[PDB]
Write a protein that binds this DNA or RNA. Structure first.
Lengths: 137, 58, 126, 175, 72, 48
RNA sequence: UAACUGGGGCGGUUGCCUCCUAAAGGGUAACGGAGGCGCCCAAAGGUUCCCUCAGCCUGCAGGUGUUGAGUGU
RNA sequence: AGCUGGUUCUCCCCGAAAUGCAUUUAGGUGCAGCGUCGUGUGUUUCUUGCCGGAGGUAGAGCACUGGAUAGCCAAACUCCGAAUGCCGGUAAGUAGCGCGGCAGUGAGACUGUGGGGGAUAAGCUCCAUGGUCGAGAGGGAAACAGCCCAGAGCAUCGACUAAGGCCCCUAAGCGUACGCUAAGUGGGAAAGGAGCCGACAAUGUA
RNA sequence: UCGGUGGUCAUAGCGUUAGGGAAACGCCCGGUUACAUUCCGAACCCGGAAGCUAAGCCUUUCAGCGCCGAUGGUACUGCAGGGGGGACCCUGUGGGAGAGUAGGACGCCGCCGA
């Protein structure tokens, strides 16, 4: 489960979600990828659940890259506490994913199994996703 | 020359839009003013382009 | 100007002198009323010109290449006395009374003192 | 060579270009060889069919004047995929230009959990503007993990030379 | 343990280019020398830039560094 | 630790200036020269 | 026998300096996000003159190094 | 009684505030902001064009600091960097300022945009910048201070329009022409599945 | 055709390649005094002119590293409107980057003295 070993500021603002991705819109490492279609915050738990889905489905061979890293801290106050008296402690680590970002990458010999593994991952994610193939530049 | 007619109310518009209409000489709905085609007046029309209609008259 | 870099082995004399010259030129500017009075100190001779940095032009100038000094008796220290005298004359001629001396990076002693004194007794106010 | 009809663009800016794409035409600019850029409007559909091929040679039927051009840079909508802009570079018959050619790997890796990584999607080479090969083929059969194919390992067709240092890795095989 | 701040200082440029000034007016209030003093401009004790002579304010780059200048 | 001293010269016998000075660093009665306005001279003001 | 206070009490804070929030002049709130101050130096002030560092490599010395060192706090 | 209530005839002209600093201070008050009247000044105000300026936001980027599997991320990162806004000059077009008398206000609300706290809540709360209500009648949204149109001196059994509408309730089209929808979709909603499903609370259609 | 002193502050730099000594600049050899070294005439200061362009300096080749860099488009945005259950998305009119591409560039402009 992915956590930053060190972060300069524990308490941070909510990463804004307007606009498209700055970059990382195209398959870079593997042969197949998951491209987001809507903005969201993907928590470190959600990335882990997706990663297990792909790796378990292929079961051997093939290599999976995770292009995004959940390094933005989100905070939550103790339950049943009135408003005020400071900010809460960080609870969830989120990667600010915007539309167009390629999140996961996968290389595998069999195309059908690759697509199936990618789809199983998508249903663990909180946004609409599309499967993209590496364009032969 | 420009024939400028005010077609929309000034209510709900920004303060500078109100002053632009006043400077053009417009004073209400359906009022008209005639001005020379000069960069200042073309600019005033553009500022309140949604509140006036401009017709080109010799 | 904006200073120069440092040097290594050779060219350290040149860089250090130039770097020193800039240090002196951050408080000594060539005005219109009192021009600059740069004085270069080479191995052979010693030149001195009266520059107008605000305009960029040079008003007067004298050196050891002039006939008055080029070939004669005396060591450098006494040889700068001629250079001091003429440049004072060539400055008095073109309407100049007060000037701002600058060392040029080298220290104020020996010829630089001697040249200054020769120019200073000729009328110019330092 | 692909013949495509092209019109001249006179309106520039955000509003003009959006209207053009709304009409299903792709704005373009033709430059190179010290000439003043010529601003073009292109038929969107004919363009995409032509651009399916990498470094396709286009003969622009520009206002009764035919000019040779090569798509140098193309801007696509990052999400929907339709063309937004084309940069066309002038090329005369038989002059050398530097272009990127995709590499297609032939054969099947040696059996095992070996995977092929494309470190460079396209190999930069200089080739004659009219005889640009569609792709460069590489034999990777029998390769094992850790084996890396260099640029100088690629068998170029005649008339093509590398535009990158000979030691740059293009392909690699991972566990 | 947060919630502490220092009340604002109103720094910044106080006379802009093309603005006619009288000798001694404040041109810039600043921390450090973001702008250096040029012709006819003096530096105060706390980096303040003030005109030495009446004229128009004009910014520029003298000797590779941003300066303020007064043009009589 | 740093007390306020009052300087005074040997002529005007008027207390002109006051300043800080670390006791333990300068235990010896501090001294310097100032402009005494009564004397109108640059005399020496021995610390009181 | 104080006030503030997402009712009041409990807890916390109250003046000054720096940064971000602060939306490219200035200013701008919250029991918003990070820190400091209640000094010190008789030189760590003034002036004149002179020098350039950190880091790296080689065996105090040499080569490289233009700011990545230092600037009482 | 820093508190609650009450304060009686009319019309004409103008017409706010719910903000800043400080406060044994927070539902009070002093000063400043915003109103009015008198007097002096007279275009000095404001709007638009052009001209001269400083910047470090949106965006973008990794050259510094940090995070991080050649591709990436950052309120307290910046090699870069607008649009606007602000200061001054000038041209054209149509209130400003000084000095005094008298105030009220200093509990704001919703809606558009840029943000913080909150939980990618609240008809929540705290800021910045517009609008309306407050103090605003009239028309529309079925009713509905804050939304859309529009600023009511008075009369009018005339005409043209704005938002919104034109089968009947109810003023005006069963309008003309092309195409789509078969679900009363229109007349509420998601991941997801093959206009549809997903669809699901209590008085009575609703 | 070179020496001194300025402006712009890399389109100028860095590196690389071939050279130059007519005056000039410098290397250069010495420490007698004035002057100096946290020790050393290495540096500063002093007095000359044996040798030399080997280095500095000047000229010169290369676009190699660094540097500058359009037009077109895009993001963004003032003003005015739409849409969406919401996070948010879109357009008309005015303005318009960053990155990247074609390319540029082995500086340029003054004043004196030989």
């Amino acid at each position: 489960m992915l956590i930053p070993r060190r972060v300069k500021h524990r308490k941070q603002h909510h990463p804004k979600r307007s606009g498209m991705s700055k970059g990382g819109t195209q398959v870079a490492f593997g042969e197949y990828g998951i491209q987001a279609l809507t903005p969201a915050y993907v928590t470190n738990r959600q990335i882990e659940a997706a990663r297990i889905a792909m790796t378990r489905h292929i079961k051997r061979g093939g290599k999976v890259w995770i292009n995004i890293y959940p390094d933005r801290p989100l905070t939550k106050k103790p339950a049943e506490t009135r408003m005020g008296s400071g900010k809460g402690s960080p609870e969830w680590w989120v990667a600010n994913v915007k539309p167009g970002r390629v999140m996961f990458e996968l290389s595998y010999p069999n195309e059908k199994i690759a697509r199936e593994a990618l789809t199983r991952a998508a249903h663990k994610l909180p946004m609409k996703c599309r499967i993209v193939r590496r364009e032969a530049g | 020359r420009l024939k400028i007619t005010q077609t929309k109310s000034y209510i709900g518009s920004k303060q500078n839009h109100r002053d632009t209409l006043r400077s053009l000489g417009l004073k209400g709905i359906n009022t008209q003013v005639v001005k020379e085609d000069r960069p200042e007046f073309r600019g005033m029309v553009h500022t309140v382009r949604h509140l006036v209609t401009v017709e080109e008259v010799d | 100007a904006y200073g120069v870099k440092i040097a290594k082995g050779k060219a350290y004399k040149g860089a250090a002198l130039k770097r020193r010259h800039i240090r002196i030129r951050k408080k000594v500017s060539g005005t219109a009323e009192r021009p600059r009075l740069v004085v270069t100190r080479s191995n052979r001779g010693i030149t001195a010109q009266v520059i107008d940095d605000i305009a960029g032009h040079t008003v007067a100038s004298a050196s050891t290449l002039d006939a008055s000094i080029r070939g004669g008796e005396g060591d450098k220290s006494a040889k700068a006395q001629q250079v001091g005298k003429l440049v004072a004359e060539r400055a008095k001629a073109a309407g100049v009374e007060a000037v701002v001396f600058d060392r040029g990076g080298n220290r104020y002693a020996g010829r630089i003192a001697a040249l200054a004194d020769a120019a200073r007794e000729a009328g110019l106010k330092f | 060579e692909v013949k495509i009809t092209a019109e001249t663009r006179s309106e520039f800016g955000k509003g003009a270009a959006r209207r053009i794409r709304r009409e299903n035409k792709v704005p373009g600019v033709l430059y190179g060889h010290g000439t003043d850029p010529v601003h073009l409007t292109l038929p969107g559909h004919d363009l995409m069919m032509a651009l399916k091929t990498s470094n396709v040679l286009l003969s622009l039927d520009l206002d009764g004047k035919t000019e040779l051009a090569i798509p140098k840079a193309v801007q696509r909508d990052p999400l929907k995929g339709f063309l937004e802009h084309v940069d066309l570079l002038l090329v005369k018959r038989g002059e050398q230009v530097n272009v990127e050619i995709p590499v297609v790997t032939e054969g099947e890796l040696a059996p095992g959990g070996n995977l092929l990584e494309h470190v460079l999607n396209a190999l930069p080479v200089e080739a004659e503007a009219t005889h640009i090969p569609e792709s460069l083929s590489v034999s990777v059969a029998g390769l094992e993990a850790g084996a890396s194919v260099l640029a100088k390992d690629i068998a170029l067709p005649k008339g093509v030379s590398l535009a990158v240092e000979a030691d740059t890795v293009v392909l690699q095989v991972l566990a | 343990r947060n919630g502490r701040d220092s009340n604002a200082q109103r720094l910044g440029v106080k006379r802009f280019g093309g603005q006619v000034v009288n000798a001694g007016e404040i041109l810039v209030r600043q921390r450090g020398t973001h702008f250096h003093p040029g012709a006819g401009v003096g530096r105060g004790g706390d980096d303040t830039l003030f005109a030495l002579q009446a004229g128009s304010v004009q910014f520029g780059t003298f000797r590779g560094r941003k300066v303020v200048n007064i043009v009589p | 630790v740093r007390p306020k001293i009052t300087l005074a010269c040997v002529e005007c016998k008027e207390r002109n200036y006051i300043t800080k000075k670390n006791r333990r660093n300068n235990p010896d009665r501090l001294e310097m020269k100032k402009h005494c306005p009564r004397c109108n001279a640059h005399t020496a003001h021995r610390e009181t």
